[PDB]
Amino acid sequence: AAAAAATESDRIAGIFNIPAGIIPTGNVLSTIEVCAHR
Amino acid sequence: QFEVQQPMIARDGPHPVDQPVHNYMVKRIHKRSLSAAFAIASEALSLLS
């Protein structure tokens, strides 16, 4: 559905210095970080 | 490196607003090894010559 307006959410994102063209509305899969010290 | 976010609830009443919380957990990698025994007789070397 919509909950708070998606257009309004994207506008609020834009006005507060974030130039996010598309705010994700769904499943997001990021990459786990593996840090090695040699 | 894991970054974990925690959901919260918008609330009201005689309580000040609470801040959403990040948590950045790190675990160090634990290293181990295993080995096994394997012997070869001398005469085998003699025949490989």
Return the ∠ at Cα A37 (arms to A33 and B3), rounded to 5°: 25
By the CB < 8 Å criterion, does A28 face chain B?
A: no
Contact call for residues B8 and B18 (beta carbons, < 8 A): yes
Q: What is the resolution of this structure in A?
A: 4.5
Would the CB atoms of B2 and A32 count as touching at under 8 Å? Answer: yes
By the CB < 8 Å criterion, does A35 face chain B?
A: yes
Closest listed residue to residue A35, CA positions, set B2, B31, B22: B2
- Which approach determined this entry? cryo-EM
Tokens read off for B45:
């070397």
- SS3 for B21? coil
